[PDB]
Design an enzyme around this catalytic site. Structure first.
Site, PDB file in Angstrom:
ATOM      1  N   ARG A 136       0.847  -1.210   0.000  1.00  0.00           N
ATOM      2  CA  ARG A 136       0.000   0.000   0.000  1.00  0.00           C
ATOM      3  C   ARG A 136       0.883   1.262   0.000  1.00  0.00           C
ATOM      4  O   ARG A 136       1.716   1.404   0.915  1.00  0.00           O
ATOM      5  CB  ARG A 136      -0.895   0.015   1.239  1.00  0.00           C
TER       6      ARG A 136
ATOM      7  N   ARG B  11      -6.452  19.178   7.162  1.00  0.00           N
ATOM      8  CA  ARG B  11      -5.207  19.024   7.959  1.00  0.00           C
ATOM      9  C   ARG B  11      -4.804  20.364   8.592  1.00  0.00           C
ATOM     10  O   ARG B  11      -4.806  21.392   7.891  1.00  0.00           O
ATOM     11  CB  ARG B  11      -4.071  18.486   7.086  1.00  0.00           C
TER      12      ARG B  11
HETATM   13  K   LIG Z   1      -4.852   8.174   2.195  1.00  0.00           K
END
Ligand SMILES: [K+]
Ligand SMILES: N[C@@H](Cc1ccccc1)C(=O)O
Ligand SMILES: N[C@@H](Cc1ccccc1)C(=O)O
Ligand SMILES: [K+]
Ligand SMILES: [K+]
Ligand SMILES: [K+]
EC number: 2.7.1.40
Lengths: 503, 508, 504, 499
Positions: C52, C99
């Site tokens: 991943r 964020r």
């Molecule tokens: K992500």
């Protein structure tokens, strides 16, 4: 989904919809020998022609067999519609016979002494009677009954000797000459294959019969004696053991394990064991045959009334149907087709009853029990056969098509009792004919030439089966069928399953 | 016990006796062979549960005395209540019968009708006692109005058959299809004739009123074709007869076509196989029998199989293999009761016929796979408190390997509810009412016992006494012994309530 | 083999090794700790099936090199094709993330009761402390109102708006904790309505097409149309790339069915669900979504809060072990490791621990019930043969189901019905070999051998390849039985051919 | 239905429909022992009060017990609403402690374990004492030794007469008199310490319902506790705590000896690799469910809620899974004993366990538990549960003497609640150890006529169930009673409409 609901939904005023799945075996004799009658008996659904070698010469049977083959091959010109027709040899087998009066009356008032002394074998009377079974005195006792002439005379041994019996009659009546005796006590030690049987069986091999109905089988070693006589040349001939006395029922398991199948002779058991019990013996032997995956035939006292009438009785339809529902593979007709006034009517009625009975079979239940009574794992072939049946139910299939050399793969599928017809495609004409012994196998004989590409050969036979199925209305375009084939030629046993749309 | 029907068949042994009791009722027709106190006593000892009187023949006086003989033989055992078996009385109606006349002369007695011969049928009263090979009187006045050329005429329970070749004003010329011996006053069937006789005649009204008068337990109503036929019988029985059970006899094609409405109006069904064999072909009657037994088993209504049972035992002391098989298969189809006719009424071996009926019914019980019957009857049900209690009693009977289900019952209803679910274990139904003990015999697996002790003031003590009685009966019939378990069903506290009470009690 | 589930739990033995294969897939997040060819080789050996790549961070250039390193590490086993393990590559999208910025110059602690000011002003974007916070959602001031609530650092911190100020927002710290740089932010009850596919996701998805990835993990999927936007961006060139929709919020759970029916599979992001859905409920959403995925025969990945302790420790807690095991027992096809393999101190250790747990959990799967139920919730010629093959694997106690597949469909069909026995899927298409790791119980093997002239010959070579892989892997030995599924003819539509073959 | 369809139908936006059927056990300590808080914990679903005898004097525990009973009996005025509340004594059990003085004392290091009683209160990061004499007799080369809560791991190299030679494997601070665990090690400590004997006799005098016996390793430890409880304490339930490997190895004979089992996951996780404890938990719960004996899940339940008013996702999932595994009861420790949110911890335990009920597939449990007629008792119990399913009943009502009847019904895990009507107050309290039993205490006098006494107690259960929302007028319940006064078991089943 419930057996009870299947019974509740039975409708006498709607035509039966499911195919007849049980085999019809017809005794061929004077009334049915002729090619023309035989053609009509085949179209009306006879699968197997039975020759009863208790009567007639080799010459007479050879001509019957020739007429059976002429009548069968008259349909060969259309391979899609041609029905194979097997030939069965039914042996005389061992008997106990009284020999000649000089008839006479008989009642307890005078005791009847039985003697084996050959100097009395033509001076039979109510005081002294001759019997041709030299070893009778070993296998009978002072309680034992002796039935004479198909159970209409019964005796009861009072004094047993070395070579003589003192009896005293029950159920008296008109004793004549050369009448058949039955010993319900049983364990009779007569050979298994008489002198006539060995000649008869050799003639069977030469006539290329498909199967033997072996009379008066009492134990495994009798079946192996018939096997040995048929010998290397007869090794592919099916041996059906006939169960006709108490010892056969008692030693059923060893006889079943020795045999290719079984015939239950109810009239013969009727004499040897009580009437309140024969139905249990029939239900038992058919159950054990179903469990083993071995053909069982019900015989005698089927449509006897049709020897002289063109329709059967209520009780005869019920008895025949209840034989189908017990799980019989085939029903056999005797005098009704051999010598009676209505041979063709007898075949047509056997067909109507077996077909009407199908309404009362709950196929999924037979399968679920039979699948659960299989071994823990078994060979590859078994897992595949059960898988094909399972798939047949779950795709509501029109058929299971099985390409087979010997029939074994078709036989394996049949044991599990699919609702779907088993179209057993064979090039071997003998395996096509033998297949009729098994509930729910529709054998077809593929005559096409062996293709060189095995996958092309398989595709042709499956196409053949697809055509047969369409013409018989088992399925049509859009339906799904299961197909069981071998893998490449070089491997052993049909281990290959596909679910294929009907094109 | 076996996991599969198949394995159950595979284990059947002809050499080992039965280990179940005979759970199906035996109905016996009482006639000149059997109507003596002496014979009836033996017949009760050998398994007869119901005595059937055929009012097709005999006077009210004749039947009063038969009934009197039945009760004398029955009460001769009343001295020991643990051994007393209740015995019911059934009255079987004439209904719309057609009968032939009397054979002429004194030197035939019976005549031979031969294949292909001509037979004249007359309504001319001058011939009602001059019947022979050439002229046959019968008593259905409008026969010539409902028959056509080609029509089939059946005589003597289907043994003789004729076809109408010419029709007259008051005669028919016919051709003998099936020959036979024709005696006096035989029964006649006209398949696909619109026979206009009434369901309840004046004689049927008089017979049903006499049944009420004589306190019969049940009526077997002949030739029922529709529900209004049943309603008509129930109206003649009226208020006085309101607890008498009506069993509708299905004897023809219309009775089968209209079966559901007949079942729903009826207390139960009799399947007359022989009579159905006349209007319905042999490849279809077994289906009729299996369908009507199944629907009855599903409705929880008693169903009797009758006709063509052990008829060979009219002349012989033993039946044929085919008759054993046919009687066994009627048990295995789910029949509650088996009925005997000429075999007991008029034959040479009435007692040997009862014993053989018992032997066959008991052997057949070995081929019944009770668990499957129960699981299917449970699934197919919808759910009041009484029903869940009964299903629970039956489930417990299997789990505990119960020797019995003891049911304390006023009406019989609770015992009937339990029997509906086909337990393996016998249902001992303890009744104080003599009529509910007698009627209980219509149901497969009920063993009714008549409690003669007075009611105790204390309910819970009355229950223990009645249960103690059942346990003495069950011990004596060898159903169970010390250390077995029985299921007990009762009400809760005195007062008509739901029989909602289930106990599992160990046998002392 | 137990007649009942209950007996199956009763017969669990902690002291006896596992008697089944590790059937669930292992997905590892590759980052600084795991990037190196050397580590990747070790991770492949210890059971890593899928790599991943988290595109929440890093450049296209950086991710290009990670993919190169994975393929170097993977292709180093190719020389023995019996032992070669396909390894898939996954691209995990940023999606519509919010964020916080960078601490001013160390870290800061947010303590309950204190004021905290949020400002739009990019001056403070690298200046976040105890008193002031910048976040990267430009419209934050326009999308909340006094009373509104705001979560930070994934979770743990909660803020209530008291004052709104056009380019500023004054809040109160309802829940405290430490505050890190660049941390995640949630706004339940506000129509954020940032697109499921931003301009950056488009770029990253087009990059994933370019770099030949096996599958996309699409972040923050809330409905069917979001999946179809991802599918569109991958377009024609990316049509065989598998889309795994991540359920990360309450809308994803409520609209699960349309997302599942639009997707190739589902990733359950337990920690993210934990933010808007209470603790008394998340285990129910996890169990529902895994159930529905098993029902539809679609792969389901369990992710987040797996072995997060192993970021700092060589070993996990018992709670982590139990939580991973129960995701497997729930019916998850794959387990995803995150920080544990991306950045932590024990990348190889976290892979090996994931293999141990997943293997030990297999002891507690009651396969017979899963199959009986999936069978009863199911016929087609394709479906009947697959079900038949699984039924026979039970009846013959087979060592494996061997499946010859082009696209993998036949192998996936067998996997939906959940046999005990491993499925050895034999492909010649390396992408199908890689993609088959999304399914529970598939062990993909790549056949390198050239196609044989004669169809039947070619089938027997591929079968013998699977036979040799199974033996090397200890699935079966000589004179065991296996089930085999093939096509019938060279172009035969439907893998409809089933055999039960002795192991030579 | 299938289990799979059951998971597929779960809906987190659907309020829980079914009642919480698992027991809640709460440790009472400084944060929870006031009458006021106890009243609120009982209303919020506390069924059993646990007293941890690891700490506190008899005087302190006697006052906690008195407050639990004051709180419980404050609800006694309404017998329809009164919830019995059980008291459990949890023993200190046999420990191994280090023993140092001064403030405190990271891999390598090489630690020496002296047993030499010289170093009683004089130990450091070179020499460490402990009060277990036989430590050197039941340990070999390779052995692990844990110190504090498994915080510090040792590895034994060398073995001698009175000493050991080990190697620090995990590093941290070494405090004073800290617990010591011996993985895979057969510890021969006495089973009942001299404090435990005092503590168990105090339990008998205080009329406690049950003992949680610490550190049970074999059947004979259970027998030793049973002998101390003696005749006066024979009706007190013994729950064996499984806390180490030997307990797991010898589980079958501990279960046969015990009235029930507590799985101590946090202690197992020291003695046993972390990736194997879920197997151990699932095995013991399965075996308990098979034997029809209560099983309690304990430790690491809602520990975050010591400091926080809400648990984590992980904790919600671990509690739910303990319920789905087949646990009869869940126990809270520090969350209720000493932390900041004790009432909130009880309320969250109720919410989680009630939500988990949606995920239980009842018929499957029953069908397997039935498959795996001992006596008329078992036959009546199985048939009651069968009838509860067929009739879709709102309850099974059991007129219990000893409660054995109720426990026998609970084994087969009906969907429907079991309303256990007891006149015996201890029976009502002990019933909470069983999943799905709702015990009620009948306070009506015994009626002269047995049938009227039965009708009275059933009408009482009928009013309880109506109040609790289990059923309403026109529903059906299953009723189990004895036959006649003083019958040996509840052998009589009725299906009765709710009036
Ligand atoms: K992500
Ligand atoms: N074998 C018989 C019976 C049969 C009919 C149809 C299907 C299967 C079997 C026949 O070929 O006619
Ligand atoms: N015994 C617990 C659990 C329970 C509640 C409700 C029904 C059944 C069981 C109680 O009474 O609260
Ligand atoms: K013969
Ligand atoms: K009559
Ligand atoms: K303690």
């Amino acid at each position: 989904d419930t057996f009870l609901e299947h019974m509740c939904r039975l409708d006498i005023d709607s035509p039966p919809i499911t195919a007849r799945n049980t085999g019809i075996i017809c005794t061929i004799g004077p009334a049915s020998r002729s090619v023309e009658t035989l053609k009509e008996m085949i179209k009306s659904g006879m699968n197997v022609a039975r020759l009863n070698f208790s009567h007639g010469t080799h010459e007479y049977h050879a001509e019957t067999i020739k007429n059976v083959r002429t009548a069968t091959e008259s349909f060969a010109s259309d391979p899609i519609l041609y029905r194979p027709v097997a030939v069965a040899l039914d042996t005389k087998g061992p008997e106990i016979r009284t020999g000649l009066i000089k008839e006479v009356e008989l009642k307890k008032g005078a005791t009847l002494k039985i003697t084996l002394d050959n100097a009395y074998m033509e001076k039979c009377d109510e005081n002294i009677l001759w019997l041709d079974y030299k070893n009778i005195c070993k296998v009978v006792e002072v309680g034992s009954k002796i039935y004479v002439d198909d159970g209409l005379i019964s005796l009861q041994v009072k004094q047993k000797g070395a070579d003589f019996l003192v009896t005293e009659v029950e159920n008296g009546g008109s004793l004549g000459s050369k009448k058949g005796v039955n010993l319900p006590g049983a364990a009779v030690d007569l050979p298994a294959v008489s002198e006539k049987d060995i000649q008869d069986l050799k003639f069977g091999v030469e006539q290329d019969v498909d199967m033997v109905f072996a009379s008066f089988i009492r134990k495994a070693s009798d079946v192996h004696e018939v096997r040995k006589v048929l010998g290397e040349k007869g090794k592919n001939i099916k041996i059906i053991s006939k169960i006709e006395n108490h010892e056969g029922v008692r030693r059923f398991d060893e006889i079943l394990e020795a045999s290719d199948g079984i015939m239950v002779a109810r009239g013969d058991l009727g004499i040897e064991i009580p009437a309140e019990k024969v139905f249990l013996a029939q239900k038992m032997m058919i159950g054990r045959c179903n469990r083993a995956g071995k053909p069982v035939i019900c015989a005698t006292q089927m449509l006897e009334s049709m020897i002289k009438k063109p329709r059967p009785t209520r009780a005869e339809g019920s008895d025949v149907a209840n034989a189908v529902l017990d799980g019989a593979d085939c029903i056999m007709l005797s005098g009704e087709t051999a010598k009676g006034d209505y041979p063709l009517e007898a075949v047509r009625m056997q067909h109507l009853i077996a077909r009407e009975a199908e309404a009362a079979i709950y196929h999924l239940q037979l399968f679920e029990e039979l699948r659960r009574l299989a071994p823990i794992a078994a060979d590859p072939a078994e897992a595949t056969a059960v898988g094909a049946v399972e798939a047949s139910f779950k795709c509501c299939s029109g058929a299971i098509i099985v390409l087979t050399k010997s029939g074994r793969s078709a036989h394996q599928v049949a044991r599990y009792r699919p609702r779907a017809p088993i179209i057993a495609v064979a090039r071997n004409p003998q395996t096509a004919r033998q297949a009729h012994l098994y509930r729910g196998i529709f054998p077809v004989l593929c005559k096409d030439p062996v293709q060189e590409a095995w996958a092309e050969d398989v595709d042709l036979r499956v196409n053949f089966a697809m055509n047969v199925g369409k013409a018989r209305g088992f399925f049509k375009k859009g339906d799904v069928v299961i197909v069981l084939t071998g893998w490449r030629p070089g491997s052993g046993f049909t281990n290959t399953m596909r679910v294929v749309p009907v094109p």
